[PDB]
């Protein structure tokens, strides 16, 4: 019943039977005969199909989707963490980080800033991942309170990204919400390759909670077992060298979640500067756009999430492939009325490329002709 | 400005100058010329004054105090702990304990049971003490929420006992309450003798948070620095062999807190059976009654707390020395409507001696002629 990693050699054999040109000729309602992971790999490796042409086909295949875009702003509630992800500044071994923690007052104030001054109705809560069971349960309790508080304030969509979750931890968080509340669980596998995953997330049975590959990857299945609906798998582009392997696994994961009746967003965040302890791979824009295009095309009902990790010039090019736009800063309680968000190197998880305030980014998108759901521009008679 | 442990040899010299008979002849308003710790030691060691006579004088000296008694019921919100107190079953090294954690639903349900079925308006929240800063802050957040939730439900008095607290941890808890809310910080020093304290609470700089004697003992001073009022020091009778040393220090601590304008309760809980890793001292009833009498007499405005650690027959004898009566069970979420509270050895901190439900214990006290404030007997037109 739980998700099982596909064997790449099997998907390769099926990809060899896919007619990629006939796939591109499909109407926006119809589905290929082969599996989505196999179709995705075939489109990726057929270089007679240009990346630009692949992106155009993906945007058209997702063009009927309504709403075209909705938004959420990240709110890091703390930068404490018990794990040791080597590409992340919040790793416990990073003794240079200034550790911060948002209480009841600060979380509420940040939510009111985002709601009233940035005009957003979507928010995402983030934490580290913690080792001992009591800390994990206490973390689930606080984030559950934050989700309930956001929903009561009028937030229409709430993401959370707080590490892997077991059944009893989901129970604690779940007591704050209802099974039909608009709440999305985010658990990015980062890499679906166990060797690259272990290289960056560390070795198991050593008090490093994220090193357990299997507890992490089945978190969505525990979430769905409890009766919830919205999920968000992800791949950290730049860890594993073989991008074709990650797109097969991510599409396979999305396809498994869809078969369970889940609504899934798909995230492929690209690496950003951080206080790392291991080098990462720089993925060019053409590979990255081709990756997004192949995922968006094969999974047309699963929105890609695009964030301000990417610079403004890249957002202009890739926004048509996305179904979710997420501007903000990965710093603890960084927002302030009328000021751009803080992204202090001393306390942030990484350095974003676009620090413009969300209401400007989202307002420029709307001014360009794409409405953004869960964004209420605080202009005119809506100002206050 | 912080509390300083008195040197026992100095208090001994002053105690030698105290006229114990003239002390007993003092009117209930007047105060001895010597220090309270010195008067307490003198009364303790003057065996020409019987314990029964000492208890009679203490009850009369506290007889004018109004209300004569108020009550609170303990609610252990979890039995996880990072420390290693050798007389406590919740010590981390006790791998036989079944660890439990109360979420939003369970805490609320327990509060409603105590309010509506037991008729109490006082509650105390308890946890373990935790090592890493994030866990301590997350614990302060949850307990702060529980305090606010209890007050909003109509609880007129809330204790908390969650270990030592630093300034930033008090800030997190404090964001849930106001500076004039009826909230009492409980931090029992257990033993004021550093050698006995280290023997039972462990050695410092080893990840055992309660081993830091000094952080614990100045917690009340941080609480008062933040502008709060109600505090509750305590001695665990049965750790240190020399009871005269502990009464000097506890009375000295209460006197320091009084000089800072604080309202203080004084707790001298007696040892109870537990999954210990070190033997404790059995203190007889006569020594214990003499201890309570000397503390109650010298600190007449600071209520002694009497709990269901003590059997019914002892409560009958010592209740006149107390200003607070606290019935309940040291098990996680143990209360159930119409049933006696659970005290399961597999999950409790220790085994209480009186498991009768609080509304029976408190109702029998009231039937005997002592009203109990913050107790609303659910009988008659107040039933349902
Ligand atoms: N240096 C970096 N640059 C860009 N994205 C990063 C990054 N470091 C981590 N991320 C991404 O940010 C995401 C959420 S922040 C991590 C949340 C949680 N502690 C967890 O580990 O699950 C991670 O899943 C990761 O994919
Ligand atoms: N075995 C036992 N019998 C009777 N009382 C005990 C006991 N073990 C601990 N206690 C008392 O119960 C009190 C509150 S329970 C401890 C709360 C918190 N974890 C802390 O250590 O501060 C302790 O201060 C201790 O004095
Ligand atoms: O990536 C996410 O899902 C989430 C975290 C985050 C960080 C930076 C910008 C947007 C963000 N949203
Ligand atoms: O001792 C306390 O202050 C508090 C904990 C506790 C345990 C058992 C009975 C009453 C209690 N109250
Ligand atoms: S990615 Fe998440 S779990 Fe890993 S070090 Fe960063 S905050 Fe911790
Ligand atoms: S007395 Fe408190 S800190 Fe010590 S082991 Fe027990 S619960 Fe933990
Ligand atoms: Br639209
Ligand atoms: Br980078
Ligand atoms: Br909206
Ligand atoms: Br009275
Ligand atoms: Br005992
Ligand atoms: Br009352
Ligand atoms: Na809009
Ligand atoms: Na009463």
Coordinates of N, CA, C and O in Angstrom, one line a residue, chain A residues 74-141:
Chain A
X74 N 6.4 31.4 2.6 CA 7.0 30.6 3.6 C 7.2 31.4 4.9 O 7.6 32.6 4.9
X75 N 6.9 30.8 6.1 CA 7.2 31.3 7.4 C 8.0 30.3 8.2 O 7.4 29.3 8.7
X76 N 9.3 30.5 8.3 CA 10.1 29.6 9.1 C 9.9 30.0 10.6 O 10.2 31.1 11.0
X77 N 9.3 29.1 11.3 CA 9.0 29.3 12.7 C 10.2 29.1 13.7 O 10.1 29.5 14.9
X78 N 11.3 28.6 13.2 CA 12.5 28.4 14.0 C 13.6 27.9 13.0 O 13.3 27.5 11.9
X79 N 14.8 28.0 13.4 CA 15.9 27.5 12.6 C 16.7 26.5 13.4 O 17.9 26.1 13.1
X80 N 16.2 26.0 14.6 CA 16.8 24.9 15.2 C 16.5 23.6 14.4 O 15.5 23.5 13.7
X81 N 17.5 22.7 14.5 CA 17.3 21.4 13.8 C 18.3 20.4 14.5 O 19.4 20.8 14.9
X82 N 17.9 19.1 14.5 CA 18.7 18.0 15.0 C 19.4 17.3 13.9 O 20.3 16.4 14.2
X83 N 19.1 17.5 12.7 CA 19.7 16.8 11.6 C 20.9 17.5 11.0 O 21.3 18.6 11.5
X84 N 21.6 16.9 10.0 CA 22.9 17.3 9.5 C 22.9 17.3 8.0 O 23.8 16.7 7.4
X85 N 21.9 17.9 7.4 CA 21.9 18.0 5.9 C 23.1 18.9 5.4 O 23.1 20.0 5.8
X86 N 24.0 18.3 4.6 CA 25.2 19.0 4.3 C 25.1 20.2 3.4 O 26.0 20.9 3.3
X87 N 23.9 20.3 2.7 CA 23.7 21.4 1.8 C 22.8 22.5 2.5 O 22.4 23.4 1.8
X88 N 22.5 22.4 3.8 CA 21.6 23.2 4.5 C 22.3 23.9 5.7 O 23.0 23.3 6.5
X89 N 22.1 25.2 5.8 CA 22.7 26.0 6.9 C 22.1 25.7 8.2 O 22.8 26.0 9.3
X90 N 20.9 25.1 8.3 CA 20.3 24.8 9.6 C 20.8 23.5 10.2 O 20.3 23.2 11.3
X91 N 21.7 22.8 9.6 CA 22.3 21.6 10.1 C 22.8 21.8 11.6 O 23.4 22.9 11.8
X92 N 22.6 20.9 12.4 CA 23.0 21.0 13.8 C 24.4 21.3 14.0 O 24.8 22.2 14.9
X93 N 25.3 20.7 13.2 CA 26.7 21.0 13.3 C 27.2 22.3 12.9 O 28.4 22.6 13.0
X94 N 26.3 23.2 12.3 CA 26.7 24.5 11.9 C 26.6 25.4 13.1 O 25.5 26.0 13.4
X95 N 27.7 25.5 13.8 CA 27.8 26.3 15.1 C 27.8 27.8 14.8 O 27.8 28.6 15.8
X96 N 27.9 28.2 13.6 CA 27.9 29.6 13.2 C 26.5 30.2 13.2 O 26.4 31.5 13.3
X97 N 25.5 29.4 13.1 CA 24.1 29.9 12.9 C 23.6 30.5 14.2 O 23.8 29.9 15.3
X98 N 22.9 31.7 14.1 CA 22.2 32.2 15.3 C 20.8 31.6 15.4 O 20.0 32.0 14.6
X99 N 20.6 30.7 16.3 CA 19.4 30.0 16.4 C 18.3 30.8 17.0 O 18.5 31.5 18.0
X100 N 17.1 30.8 16.4 CA 16.0 31.6 16.8 C 14.7 30.7 16.9 O 14.7 29.6 16.3
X101 N 13.7 31.2 17.6 CA 12.5 30.5 17.9 C 11.4 31.5 18.0 O 11.4 32.4 18.9
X102 N 10.3 31.3 17.2 CA 9.2 32.2 17.3 C 8.1 31.6 18.2 O 7.7 30.5 18.1
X103 N 7.7 32.5 19.2 CA 6.6 32.1 20.1 C 5.3 32.5 19.6 O 5.1 32.8 18.4
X104 N 4.3 32.5 20.5 CA 2.9 32.8 20.1 C 2.8 34.3 19.5 O 2.1 34.5 18.5
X105 N 3.5 35.2 20.2 CA 3.4 36.6 19.7 C 4.0 36.8 18.3 O 3.4 37.4 17.5
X106 N 5.2 36.2 18.1 CA 5.9 36.5 16.9 C 5.2 35.8 15.7 O 5.1 36.4 14.6
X107 N 4.8 34.6 15.9 CA 4.1 33.9 14.8 C 2.8 34.6 14.4 O 2.6 34.9 13.2
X108 N 2.0 35.0 15.4 CA 0.8 35.8 15.1 C 1.1 37.1 14.4 O 0.5 37.4 13.4
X109 N 2.1 37.8 14.8 CA 2.5 39.1 14.2 C 2.9 38.9 12.7 O 2.5 39.7 11.9
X110 N 3.7 37.8 12.5 CA 4.1 37.6 11.1 C 2.9 37.2 10.2 O 2.9 37.7 9.1
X111 N 2.0 36.4 10.8 CA 0.8 36.1 10.0 C 0.0 37.4 9.7 O -0.6 37.5 8.6
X112 N -0.1 38.3 10.6 CA -0.9 39.5 10.4 C -0.2 40.4 9.4 O -0.8 41.1 8.6
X113 N 1.2 40.4 9.4 CA 1.9 41.2 8.4 C 1.7 40.6 7.0 O 1.4 41.4 6.1
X114 N 1.8 39.3 6.8 CA 1.6 38.7 5.5 C 0.1 38.9 5.0 O -0.1 39.2 3.9
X115 N -0.8 38.8 6.0 CA -2.2 38.9 5.6 C -2.6 40.3 5.2 O -3.1 40.6 4.1
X116 N -2.2 41.3 6.0 CA -2.7 42.7 5.8 C -1.8 43.5 5.0 O -2.3 44.3 4.2
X117 N -0.5 43.3 5.1 CA 0.4 44.2 4.3 C 0.9 43.5 3.0 O 1.1 44.2 2.0
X118 N 1.0 42.2 3.0 CA 1.4 41.5 1.7 C 0.2 41.0 1.0 O 0.3 40.8 -0.2
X119 N -1.0 40.9 1.6 CA -2.2 40.6 0.9 C -2.3 39.1 0.5 O -3.1 38.8 -0.4
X120 N -1.6 38.2 1.2 CA -1.6 36.8 0.8 C -2.5 36.1 1.7 O -2.8 36.4 2.9
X121 N -3.1 35.0 1.1 CA -4.0 34.1 1.9 C -3.5 32.7 1.9 O -4.2 31.8 2.2
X122 N -2.2 32.5 1.5 CA -1.5 31.2 1.7 C -0.2 31.4 2.5 O 0.5 32.4 2.3
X123 N 0.0 30.4 3.3 CA 1.2 30.5 4.2 C 1.7 29.1 4.4 O 1.0 28.1 4.3
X124 N 3.1 29.0 4.5 CA 3.7 27.7 4.8 C 4.5 27.8 6.1 O 5.4 28.7 6.2
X125 N 4.4 26.8 7.0 CA 5.1 26.8 8.2 C 6.3 25.8 8.1 O 6.1 24.7 7.6
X126 N 7.5 26.2 8.5 CA 8.7 25.4 8.4 C 9.4 25.3 9.7 O 9.4 26.3 10.5
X127 N 10.0 24.2 10.0 CA 10.9 23.9 11.1 C 12.0 23.1 10.7 O 12.2 22.7 9.5
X128 N 12.9 22.8 11.6 CA 13.9 21.7 11.4 C 13.2 20.3 11.6 O 12.0 20.2 11.8
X129 N 14.0 19.3 11.6 CA 13.5 18.0 12.0 C 14.3 17.5 13.2 O 15.5 17.7 13.3
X130 N 13.6 16.9 14.2 CA 14.2 16.7 15.5 C 14.2 15.2 15.8 O 13.5 14.4 15.2
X131 N 15.1 14.8 16.7 CA 15.4 13.4 16.9 C 14.6 12.7 18.0 O 13.9 11.7 17.7
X132 N 14.5 13.2 19.2 CA 13.8 12.5 20.2 C 12.3 12.7 20.1 O 11.8 13.7 19.6
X133 N 11.5 11.6 20.4 CA 10.1 11.6 20.2 C 9.4 12.7 20.9 O 8.4 13.3 20.3
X134 N 9.8 13.1 22.1 CA 9.1 14.2 22.7 C 9.2 15.5 22.0 O 8.3 16.3 21.9
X135 N 10.4 15.8 21.5 CA 10.6 17.0 20.7 C 9.8 17.0 19.4 O 9.2 18.0 19.1
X136 N 9.8 15.9 18.7 CA 9.0 15.8 17.5 C 7.5 16.0 17.8 O 6.8 16.7 17.1
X137 N 7.0 15.4 18.9 CA 5.6 15.6 19.3 C 5.3 17.1 19.7 O 4.3 17.6 19.3
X138 N 6.2 17.7 20.5 CA 6.1 19.1 20.8 C 6.1 20.0 19.6 O 5.4 21.0 19.6
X139 N 6.9 19.6 18.6 CA 7.0 20.4 17.4 C 5.7 20.3 16.6 O 5.2 21.3 16.1
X140 N 5.1 19.1 16.5 CA 3.9 18.9 15.8 C 2.8 19.7 16.5 O 1.9 20.2 15.8
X141 N 2.8 19.8 17.9 CA 1.8 20.6 18.6 C 1.9 22.0 18.2 O 0.8 22.7 18.0

